[PDB]
């Protein structure tokens, strides 16, 4: 249930620029284009990312590439950050995934801002950490997503991603039988 597949589920895949009802211009796998309202500005960022004139549309491969770069930036950020490192080092592979997910979502600066929750995680105070992180804006604004991540922190398993992966691949047809 690697990070790649974990974020894959979380972010989903969209080949065409989009923006949630209350979201920003995004594309592919949770790839944020800009906080600007103009479609143009988003497209610009995109082309800039793709290397061609996209007209707000990319291929699966393109998405892939972007995803990797995004995951790589997340990982990198965590490793070079004195606050995330120590924590990252202490986590199991599952939880490390949880942290990479937060970083991918809100950035290393933002994540590094979780002083207490971070310490708890480093102390293996799973529950405490879950309780704490539960009162964040992150959790507040992306409850569902955050719930899954947090859940991964307290258990250190993929339980929260259980029927999702099944669902996504050979799902809903087999899911019911």
Swiss-Prot record:
Keywords: Antimicrobial, Bacteriolytic enzyme, Cytolysis, Glycosidase, Host cell lysis by virus, Host cytoplasm, Hydrolase, Viral release from host cell
Enzyme Commission identifier(s): 3.2.1.17
pH dependence, entry free text: Optimum pH is 7.3.
SUPFAM superfamilies the record matches: Lysozyme-like (SSF53955)
Family membership: Belongs to the glycosyl hydrolase 24 family.
Gene Ontology, cellular component aspect: host cell cytoplasm
UniProt-recorded name of the protein: Endolysin
GO biological process, one term: peptidoglycan catabolic process
Impact after mutating residue 20 to C: Nearly no effet on specific enzymatic activity
Catalytic residues identified in the record: 11, 20
Lineage, broadest ranks: Viruses, Duplodnaviria, Heunggongvirae, Uroviricota, Caudoviricetes
UniProt cross-references to Gene3D superfamilies, sorted A to Z: 1.10.530.40
UniProt GO MF annotations: lysozyme activity
Organism: Enterobacteria phage T4
Residues reported to bind substrate: 32, 104, 117, 132
Predominant cellular place of this UniProt entry's protein: host cell
Catalysed reactions, as listed in the record: Hydrolysis of (1->4)-beta-linkages between N-acetylmuramic acid and N-acetyl-D-glucosamine residues in a peptidoglycan and between N-acetyl-D-glucosamine residues in chitodextrins
Function: Endolysin with lysozyme activity that degrades host peptidoglycans and participates with the holin and spanin proteins in the sequential events which lead to the programmed host cell lysis releasing the mature viral particles. Once the holin has permeabilized the host cell membrane, the endolysin can reach the periplasm and break down the peptidoglycan layer.
Induction remarks: Expressed late in the viral replication.
């Amino acid at each position: 249930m690697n990070i790649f597949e974990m974020l894959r589920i979380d972010e989903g895949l969209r080949l065409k620029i989009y923006k949630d009802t209350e979201g920003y211009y995004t594309i592919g796998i949770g790839h944020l284009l800009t906080k600007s309202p103009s479609l143009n500005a988003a497209k610009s960022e995109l082309d800039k990312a793709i290397g061609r004139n996209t007209n707000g549309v990319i291929t699966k491969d393109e998405a892939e590439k972007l995803f990797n770069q995004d995951v790589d930036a997340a990982v990198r950020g965590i490793l070079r950050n004195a606050k995330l490192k120590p924590v990252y080092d202490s986590l199991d592979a599952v939880r490390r995934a949880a942290l990479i997910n937060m970083v991918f979502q809100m950035g290393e600066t933002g994540v590094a801002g979780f002083t207490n929750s971070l310490r708890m995680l480093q102390q293996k105070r799973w529950d405490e950490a879950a309780v704490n992180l539960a009162k964040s804006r992150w959790y507040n604004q992306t409850p569902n997503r955050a719930k899954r991540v947090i859940t991964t922190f307290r258990t250190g398993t993929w339980d929260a991603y259980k029927n999702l992966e099944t669902y996504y691949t050979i799902g809903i047809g087999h899911l019911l039988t």
